[PDB]
Write a protein that binds this ligand. Structure first.
Ligand code: G1G
Lengths: 14, 358, 736, 103, 17, 734
RNA sequence: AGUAGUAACAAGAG
RNA sequence: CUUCUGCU
């Protein structure tokens, strides 16, 4: 059930 | 090109520079001394500079600034800017100071081009300026001639000498200290007309050997910037009020003349001029700054700016306080030495202090 | 009816009309002749302001040195450099307490910078003192010459390409017993360890030309290549620290600076108690550079680098150590004349130490007599003070530390203070219950500054009610006032090239409309005046004009040939189509829809010989110096067109001994330009590799030849010829 | 990255007067803790070094003293108000534009 | 619009008759 | 092929051979810029001087074969002389003109494709629309704005990766394209750059311009989008605004952001109105976003936001009741909470004022790669169930949930160099800074969050700080579901008069209290078309325009204040200003100012025009009687509480007596006409509630007193009070 | 002579 | 003399 996330302003963790 | 005669070779200072030799070759010369580095000779103020400034803020018919056409106006803001610009151009194009700008820019441009081109030859340069009379006919005026000398300008501060001859109708003996560097010759009986019928006032040719530097020439050919410094300020004075009243106040300030600013003094007291007179006065001030630019003007401008800020704070009831007032006054007074423009500016500042604290 | 523009201030507030008080429409006062007098005066003043310090003699350079640190306290308002180390350390400690972890985080970032910084970074900037020639040279040239000299002397650790290795090489060179340099007749010169040290710590001195607002001229100094390496790391650390300081307005610039100052001042005014009277002090600090002792910067660097690795502390502290031992080169010298014999002559500054005093005037004679004891090998020892210090950020940090010390938790009194500081300029806000409190706070701030050596200039400073002030020529009157006179010199023809000038001129007009309050009518007239000046400068008047110029024939022919006149560029005599609507559109794109196809193709032909492309760092970028401040990089939008040519270069070096250097430059270009034909990305991204250029180019040629053969872009005969040539090149390199 | 040799001697020499070694100074700074040195020095410093604020009132500023030497003389590159212009009401001759012809 | 202000043979721009 | 021949020739020469052999590729970067020519320190004069000489330009040596040495007029186009320091010959500008006149022509269809950044400006200016020019009191604030928007789906690295691959496909190196966007852009550029002879450096520079995002600090007053910043000079002036609508399409994100800012300003302004629903409907029907009416935009753009949804409910559209936080769409399924500012100290000693939410609440988070069910209380995460598709997604969702919790254990987990104020010293959103910091590094937060035992439940698996799942231990209140979590749906709602949205069962879903209080800036310019054209502007503009309106209508306001002040206070022109006064102190300030005006009217004379102008906007809200005395009144401005001093001048509100001009926040507001009725005569009567300021102290009635201490006086007695900026004055209690 | 102002220019190196 | 140069 792939879904979007509307507004977003984040990058990937490490 | 002019023939290298003895008169030109003297007036143009040819061979006046001492021959350059290594120190090991002349270390034993009895009079060998370092270059003279004394302070400039002090001089007092005279009424001629104030009279000249008054004349420069006058209105004439000969327009001096015909500006190439810009792209077609489309945006409503562009139409408003064009409508204002019209008033600015009409008010600043007929000002005498604009005449000084056009003639000065042409003279410096011609001198720089001739200096770079004919480095080793004396050149005759007419002082031609173009204007448009009231009836719209285009008229070409000649103010005199300039003989440019050797122009081997290496450094930006090197000097090129030139002999300037200017036609005039003025008795030098009437006011001699104004023409201390000039040699005035009576050359004719000009049939000026007046209204009675005609006056035969004699033409006086002011022949003087002047000198200009490369940097001075470059800044001289950019004298048109004066038209910006004054007009921008004027626009800032218009746009502020328009912001307050939320209406274009160009017509109110120029035609209706509803608002006036204190721009001069007379026996009756401070005189107030319209926006047009303010614009002409600011333009004349900027033009004279360009014509009489010098280090003294820069120093006095900075120090007097500090004093002006202090006086403004006092006027605004900000309880201004100084740590060393005499030190600031000394700094201002050390910059008043020889330049007539700086002396006039100091006199103007004294008048402002007199009028701003009473 | 004597008109007087100054009377206009009777109605308009001075700040709102401040532009009127700027004479920037006239030529700036240049400096004539040598800067030796100003340099000697600066040295004498620097030593006089610290005359009560301890005199010592260096065991390495042998020159006298002055240590004013911890000297007597100032007994008069006369400028004093006797900074107290304990007070400086206490100020730094309080700064750290007020902003916990500032030094730790700044050190962590600065450290990383040190690890990742390459040697090429020293190429940025200009006019560095090349110790191999005793003359100012471009940063890249001085760096290359120093690298070549080091390699010839056995210092071969700089090949890693890391700046820290070059610094290590500098250190080893400092320990070298003898140095070998080349001169050109390509002679060889040997320098002893002492002489090397003196010429490695030497600072060249010149005069600050075109400076406005000052009557008397001044002297500026440029350091050598050795010092620049450590100065870069010290400035990077100071910048990292300043970015975290609210009162430090130095690292930021442009609108970002004005925004920071407006926000900071606003908050400062806000948090102030309603019952507390507030005042603002505006003014510079007298003799800022002459009194900032390098030992204080060493103390601050040591305190900042506490707990950091020893290598980091050493690399950061090397710069202040070298600056404390710095020697200033006197300069060009002096000029003498004989009126009776009518002949001129020049005495180099190196001869002033032995020349007779009868040739000088009273002022210069006194200056020479006062500097003679400090004169060593033509250079004057300058241990005290910081001649044209590059530690602008470090000095700003020190000033901010003094400013931060004015919090109510540090003053332990009713009065308190805060403010802004950038280099030597500052604006201090003092809050106190009453005027007595304000006076006590001002006195305490002044005395504390004296403690650190900083000293407010009572001559050019004033205090008024809070709300209006001046900071770095920005006039705040309940909000920064848009001064336009400062940007006037930026108008007119920039002078880059025929194409960059137009884009820069319209960009300047647009920027001034956005930032410096340029009205639309004034913008129009400005645009008109600029086009007129542009046409009169590049001789690009309109084709239908009757004006006579040496370039009038070609323009006239082009105008007659073109069918759509409006499409011609202004540089080709075309009509001007700019206005407020399109000041942001490059003229090539603006007229593209109107340009004739033949002319459009000729003008934008990529094979044209006039267009040249350097590194991307210098593509569509220009260096512009405004009325105040240093040079700034301006980026302009312009299309590559035949008008984007390059002006002629100065050939005065063509008839001097150093002409060989220019030739070498030519050779280098002849090689670098060839490498671009082998590695196309050489300009877009810096190439890397330890192999010799010839090896890389030959290898790439072999690979490309094979790939082209396999793809069929070349024939069998062409491939055979290529390899034959490659084998010949390999043999040529081996044969030598 | 070690400081040694000539660098070490230079570092040892570029320190406050009461110090004689770089390591000694670094150790002193590492162990330094504020103990009111500023308050003590401020108390010790003479009371005559102060920024006394003299009030600026309407009667304080006097006029600027201008020089008393000989009267100033014209120094412009060209005449401003005394200039006389010889002009042609309308340029209609051959060679219009060249300054020599018009002159 | 005419630039105007409440303030023969001008020595600058005269007549010749 | 001739490059190898040139290399052989260079090798043949001894000096060139030595240079090529000794200089490594690494050393090339240093010798590449090895020149003798020092950067010009005065380019304008040098250019003006060199244009006079015969050959100021330098051209490639090739020109000698492409241009005749002299034209038909005999003028020399070039010279055999070689430029100093290169092989370029020295040529005159006549050569450039000759080339442009009859030089070799080529096709130029590639230029619009390579210079797309410059040509798009012309294309969008050609289709732009110009509205009326309105003269106003423009208040331009300095902030960071977009110069080149770049590509929204590519970062710096991604942009360079495409650039390199498109311009120098062989020199790409080890880098590899790893995104559909990168592949599509690379394919399109390669298709467009077929047979392009333009210099590769220019192609790379233009591609960098078009792709890498660039921002700069500019004084803006309108939209901050690139399409608007480029024409900033034309649109926003110092005393005017030009309604402009740039051509082409607008980014959906810009429209969404602008709509959010406009809706938030509208609801904040309409909340202080007497009829909030009617005011909101009128504002929404009059407002336009980038030339598009907001009324028709709300019906097509969801932009879930506590304000957008409200506006939609007012308009009758179905709302989403969801808000986006950290890339996750949160839907409040149950519970309610109330915002309140709280002061906290982070792990790096920084102090922050965060908007803590009180009350138990339950949310559903939907993300592009995760979905979670969250249940939180006041600064505490009760439970969290994540159903992320990937381990990285699980970590991202957990970090977002922890930051959203606002738990103290997370605030104390902040470590290293974290700044809550930018280089311009502006105050950033603490939640965003925390989210960014913890997404950059979450090891510390996971370590310090805490661990709890796991109740064995089918389908629920715990997760440990090292990210490895465990069945016996897990992070405090954290579970991972492998079966998925359920879903977006719009529910019709009813909105009452006071903007309190309720569902079909009457449960209140949205209220104006939860709308964010941050006064942001719109990406796309917002235009208002009502008489009060500054109704929805920012704080500084609202204040300046409010006082400007008061001064312009002073001839009538004075009469109304002197005759019917109760009706004047209710004038709509003061409602926007009330939006800036704090909600808690609104009534106190209104009552205080109303009493001050009444006491000024009772005491004959003592009229003070400046005091009335300054305090009039504070009387609009309903009165709330109190014994409190205010020395200054606070107004919110971009998160800062500006204090207006009741007595005296302040930087926020100043009256220059010399020019008789009012300045608000440094912007001129107008001149006050000379009023013969003023007659201050020393006594103020408008500084303290129920007290008259007699004047200068005399050291007889008392040494000094505080503003609150003055309440001790009963009646008639006189005493000295320290009121204002250290100005002690004599006062009398009625 | 003149420019100009704390030191130059009034050509310089071959 | 001629050559070379106007920021080196
Ligand atoms: O760039 C701005 C905003 O544009 C104005 C933009 N933005 C939001 N939504 C969208 C969108 O859908 N599409 C686009 N393109 N842009 C969007 O996001 C940025 C938000 O900036 P800012 O105004 O500083 O954020 P703000 O609205 O003030 O608050 P924020 O921190 O993001 O919080 C968002 C909502 O979450 C509520 N909230 C936070 N917490 C911790 C809780 C809580 O614990 N309980 C409840 N019930 N709510 C919480 C915030 O209050 C706010 O409502």
């Amino acid at each position: 059930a792939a879904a979007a996330a509307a507004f977003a302003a984040a990058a990937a963790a490490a | 090109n002019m023939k290298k005669t003895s008169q030109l070779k003297w007036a143009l200072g040819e061979n006046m520079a001492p021959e350059k030799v290594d120190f090991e070759d002349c270390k034993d010369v009895n009079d060998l001394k370092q270059y003279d580095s004394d302070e400039p000779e002090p001089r007092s103020l005279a009424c001629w500079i104030q009279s000249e400034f008054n004349k420069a803020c006058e209105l004439t018919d000969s327009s001096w600034v015909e500006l190439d056409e810009i792209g077609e106006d489309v945006a409503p803001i562009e139409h408003i800017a064009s409508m204002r610009r019209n008033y600015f151009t009409a008010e600043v194009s007929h000002c005498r100071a604009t005449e000084y700008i056009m003639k000065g820019v042409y003279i410096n441009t011609a001198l720089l081009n001739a200096s770079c081109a004919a480095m080793d030859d004396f050149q005759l340069i007419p002082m031609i300026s173009k204007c448009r009379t009231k009836e719209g006919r285009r008229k070409t005026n000649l103010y005199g001639f300039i003989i440019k000398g050797r122009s081997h300008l290496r450094n930006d501060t090197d000097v090129v000498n030139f002999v300037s001859m200017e036609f005039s109708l003025t008795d030098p003996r009437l006011e001699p200290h104004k023409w201390e560097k000039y040699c005035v010759l009576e050359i004719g009986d000009m049939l000026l007309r007046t209204a009675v019928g005609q006056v035969s006032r004699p033409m006086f040719l002011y022949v003087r050997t002047n000198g200009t530097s490369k940097i001075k020439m470059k800044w001289g050919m950019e004298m048109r910037r004066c038209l910006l410094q004054s007009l921008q300020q004027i626009e800032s004075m218009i746009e502020a009020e328009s912001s307050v009243k939320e209406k274009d106040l160009t017509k109110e300030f120029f035609e209706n003349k509803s608002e006036t600013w204190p721009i001069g003094e007379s026996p009756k007291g401070v005189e107030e001029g319209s926006i047009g007179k303010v614009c002409r006065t600011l333009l004349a001030k900027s033009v004279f700054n360009s014509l009489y630019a010098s280090p003294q003007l820069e120093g006095f401008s900075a120090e007097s700016r500090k004093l002006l800020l202090i006086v403004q704070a006092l006027r605004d009831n900000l309880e201004p306080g100084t740590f060393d007032l005499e030190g600031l006054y000394e700094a201002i007074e050390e910059c008043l030495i020889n330049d007539p423009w700086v002396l006039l500016n100091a006199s103007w500042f004294n008048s402002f202090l007199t009028h701003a604290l009473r | 009816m004597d008109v007087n523009p100054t009377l206009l201030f009777l109605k308009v507030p001075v700040q709102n009309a401040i532009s009127t008080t700027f004479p920037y429409t006239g030529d700036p006062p240049y400096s004539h002749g040598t800067g030796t007098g100003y340099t000697m005066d600066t040295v004498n003043r620097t030593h006089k302001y610290s005359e009560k310090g301890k005199w010592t003699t260096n065991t390495e350079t042998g020159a006298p040195q002055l240590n004013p640190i911890d000297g007597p306290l100032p007994e008069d308002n006369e400028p004093s450099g006797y900074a107290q180390t304990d007070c400086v350390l206490e100020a730094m400690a309080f700064l750290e307490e007020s902003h916990p972890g500032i030094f730790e985080n700044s050190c962590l970032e600065t450290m990383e910078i040190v690890q990742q910084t390459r040697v090429d970074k020293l190429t940025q900037g200009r006019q560095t003192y090349d110790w191999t020639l005793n003359r100012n040279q471009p940063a890249a040239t001085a760096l290359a010459n120093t690298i070549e000299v080091f390699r010839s002397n056995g210092l071969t650790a700089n090949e890693s390409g890391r700046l820290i290795d070059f610094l290590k090489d500098v250190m080893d060179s400092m320990d070298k017993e003898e140095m070998e340099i080349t001169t050109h007749g390509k002679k060889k010169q040997r320098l002893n360890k002492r002489s090397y040290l003196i010429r490695a710590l030497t600072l060249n001195t010149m005069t600050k030309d075109a400076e406005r607002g000052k009557l008397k001229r001044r002297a500026i100094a440029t350091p050598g290549m050795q010092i620049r390496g450590f100065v870069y790391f010290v400035e990077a650390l100071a910048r990292s620290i300043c970015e975290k300081l609210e009162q430090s307005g130095l690292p930021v610039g442009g609108n970002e600076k004005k925004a920071k100052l407006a926000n900071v001042v606003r908050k400062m005014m806000t948090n102030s108690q309603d019952t507390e009277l507030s005042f603002t002090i505006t003014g510079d600090n007298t003799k800022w550079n002459e009194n900032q002792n390098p030992r204080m910067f060493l103390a601050m660097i040591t305190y900042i680098t506490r707990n950091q690795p020893e290598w980091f502390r050493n690399v950061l502290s090397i710069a202040p150590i070298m600056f404390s031992n710095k020697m200033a080169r006197l300069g060009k010298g002096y000029m003498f004349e004989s009126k009776s014999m009518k002949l001129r002559t020049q005495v180099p500054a190196e001869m002033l130490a032995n020349i007779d005093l009868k040739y000088f005037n009273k002022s210069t004679r006194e200056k020479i007599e006062k500097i003679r004891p400090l004169l060593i090998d033509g250079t004057a020892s300058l241990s005290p003070g910081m001649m044209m210090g590059m530690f602008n950020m470090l000095s700003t940090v020190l000033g901010v530390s003094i400013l931060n010390l004015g919090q109510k938790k540090y003053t332990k009194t009713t009065y308190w203070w805060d403010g802004l500081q950038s280099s030597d300029d500052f604006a201090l806000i003092v809050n106190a219950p009453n005027h007595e409190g304000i006076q006590a706070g001002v006195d305490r701030f002044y005395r504390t500054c004296k403690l650190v050596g900083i000293n407010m200039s009572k001559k050019k400073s004033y205090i008024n009610r809070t709300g209006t002030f001046e900071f770095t020529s920005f006039f705040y009157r309940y909000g920064f006032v848009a001064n336009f006179s400062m940007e006037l010199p930026s108008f007119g023809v920039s002078g880059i090239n025929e194409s960059a000038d137009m884009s820069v001129g319209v960009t300047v007009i647009k920027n001034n409309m956005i930032n410096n309050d340029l009205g639309p009518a004034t913008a129009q007239m400005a645009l008109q005046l600029f086009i007129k000046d542009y046409r009169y400068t590049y001789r690009c008047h309109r084709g239908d004009t009757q004006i006579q110029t040496r370039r009038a024939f070609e323009l006239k022919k082009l105008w007659e040939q073109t069918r759509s006149k409006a499409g011609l560029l202004v540089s080709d005599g075309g009509p001007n189509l700019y206005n407020i609507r399109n000041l942001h559109i490059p003229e090539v794109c603006l007229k593209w829809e109107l340009m004739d196809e033949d002319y459009q193709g000729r003008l934008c032909n990529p094979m044209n010989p006039f267009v040249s492309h350097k590194e991307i760092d210098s593509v569509n970028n220009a260096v512009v110096m405004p009325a105040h401040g240093p040079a700034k990089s301006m980026e302009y939008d312009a299309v590559a067109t035949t008008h984007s040519w390059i002006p002629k270069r100065n050939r005065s070096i063509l008839n001097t001994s150093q002409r060989g250097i220019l030739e070498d430059e030519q050779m280098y270009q002849k090689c670098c330009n060839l490498f671009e034909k082998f590695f196309p990305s050489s300009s877009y991204r810096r190439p890397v590799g330890i192999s010799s250029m010839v090896e890389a180019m030959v290898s790439r040629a072999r690979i490309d030849a094979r790939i082209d053969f396999e793809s069929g872009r070349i024939k069998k005969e062409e491939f055979a010829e290529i390899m034959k040539i490659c084998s010949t090149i390999e043999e040529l390199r081996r044969q030598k | 990255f070690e400081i040694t040799g000539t660098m070490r001697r230079l570092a040892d020499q570029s320190l406050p007067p009461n110090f004689s070694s770089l390591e000694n100074f670094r150790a002193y700074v590492d162990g330094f803790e504020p103990n009111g040195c500023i308050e003590g020095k401020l108390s010790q410093m003479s009371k005559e070094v102060n920024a006394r604020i003299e009030p600026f009132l309407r009667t304080t500023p006097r006029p600027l003293r201008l020089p008393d030497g000989p009267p100033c003389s014209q120094r412009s590159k060209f005449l401003l108000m005394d200039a006389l212009k010889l002009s042609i009401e309308d340029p209609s001759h051959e060679g219009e534009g060249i300054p020599l012809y018009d002159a | 619009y005419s630039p105007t202000s409440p303030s023969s043979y001008s020595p600058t721009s005269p007549s010749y008759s | 092929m001739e490059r190898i021949k040139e290399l052989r020739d260079l090798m043949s020469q001894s000096r060139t051979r030595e240079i090529l052999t000794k200089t490594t590729v690494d050393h090339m970067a240093i010798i590449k810029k090895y020149t003798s020519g020092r950067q010009e320190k005065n380019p304008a004069l040098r250019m003006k001087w060199m244009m006079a000489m015969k050959y100021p330009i330098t051209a490639d040596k090739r020109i000698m074969e492409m241009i005749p040495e002299r034209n038909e007029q005999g003028q020399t186009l070039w010279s055999k002389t070689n430029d100093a320091g290169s092989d370029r010959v020295m040529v005159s500008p006549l050569a450039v003109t000759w080339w442009n006149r009859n030089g070799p022509t080529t096709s130029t269809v590639h230029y619009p494709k390579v210079y797309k950044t410059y040509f798009e400006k012309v294309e969008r200016l050609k289709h732009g629309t110009f509205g009326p020019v309105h003269f106003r009191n423009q208040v331009k604030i300095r902030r960071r704005v977009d110069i080149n928007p770049g590509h929204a789906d590519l970062s710096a690295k991604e942009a360079q990766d495409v650039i390199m691959e498109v311009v120098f496909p062989n020199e790409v190196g080890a880098r590899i394209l790893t995104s559909e966007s990168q592949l599509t852009i690379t394919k399109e550029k390669k298709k467009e750059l077929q047979d392009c002879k333009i210099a590769p450096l220019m192609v790379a520079y233009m591609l960098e311009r078009e792709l890498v995002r660039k921002t700069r600090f500019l004084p803006v007053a309108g939209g901050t989008s690139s399409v608007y910043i480029e024409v900033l000079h034309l649109t926003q002036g110092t005393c005017w605004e030009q309604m402009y609508t740039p051509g082409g399409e607008v980014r959906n994100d810009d429209v969404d952001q602008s709509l959010i800012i406009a809706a938030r300003n509208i609801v904040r302004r309409a909340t202080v109105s007497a009829d909030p629903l009617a005011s909101l409907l009128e504002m929404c029907h009059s407002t336009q976003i980038g030339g598009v009416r907001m009324v028709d935009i709300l019906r097509q753009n969801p932009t879930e936001e506590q304000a957008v949804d409200i506006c939609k409910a007012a308009m009758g559209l179905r709302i989403s009741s969801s808000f986006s936080f950290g890339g996750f769409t949160f839907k409040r399924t149950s519970g309610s909470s109330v915002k309140r500012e709280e002061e906290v100290l982070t792990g790096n000693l920084q102090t922050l004022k965060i908007r803590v939410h009180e009350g138990y609440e339950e949310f559903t988070m939907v993300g592009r790669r995760a979905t979670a069910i969250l249940r939180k209380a006041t600064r505490r995460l009760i439970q969290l169930i994540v159903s992320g598709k990937d381990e990285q997604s699980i970590a991202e969702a957990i970090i977002v949930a922890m930051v959203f919790s606002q738990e103290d254990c997370m605030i104390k987990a902040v470590r290293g160099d974290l700044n809550f104020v930018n280089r311009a010293n502006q105050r950033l959103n603490p939640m965003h800074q925390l989210l960014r910091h913890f997404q950059k590094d979450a090891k510390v937060l996971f370590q310090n969050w805490g661990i709890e035992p796991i109740d064995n439940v089918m389908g629920m698996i715990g997760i440990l700080p090292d990210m490895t799942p465990s069945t016996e231990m897990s992070l405090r209140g954290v579970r991972v579901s492998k079966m998925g979590v359920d879903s977006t749906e719009r529910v019709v709602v009813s909105i009452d008069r006071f903007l309190r949205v309720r569902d079909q069962r009457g449960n209140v879903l949205l209220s104006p209290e939860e709308v964010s209080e941050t006064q942001g800036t719109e990406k796309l310019t917002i235009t208002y078309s009502s008489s009060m054209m500054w109704e929805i502007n920012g704080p500084e503009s609202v204040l300046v325009n409010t006082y400007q309106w008061i001064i312009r209508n002073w001839e009538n306001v004075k009469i109304q204040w002197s005759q019917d002040p109760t009706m004047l206070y209710n004038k709509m022109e003061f409602e926007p200003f009330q939006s800036l006064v704090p909600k808690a102190a609104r009534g106190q300030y209104s009552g205080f100012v109303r009493v001050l005006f009444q006491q000024m009217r009772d005491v004959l004379g003592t009229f003070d025009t400046v005091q009335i102008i300054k305090l009039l906007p504070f009387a609009a809200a309903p009165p709330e009687q109190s014994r409190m005395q205010f020395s200054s009144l606070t107004v919110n401005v971009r998160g800062s509480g500006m204090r207006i001093v009741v007595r005296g001048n302040s930087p926020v509100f100043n009256y220059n007596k010399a020019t008789k001009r009012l300045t608000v926040l440094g912007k001129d507001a107008g001149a006050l006409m000379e009023d013969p009725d003023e007659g201050t005569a020393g006594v103020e009567s408008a500084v303290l509630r129920g007290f008259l300021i007699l004047g200068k102290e005399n050291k007889r009635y008392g040494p000094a007193l505080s503003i609150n201490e003055l309440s001790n006086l009963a009646k008639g007695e006189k005493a000295n009070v320290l009121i204002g900026q250290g100005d002690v004055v004599l006062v009398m209690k009625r």
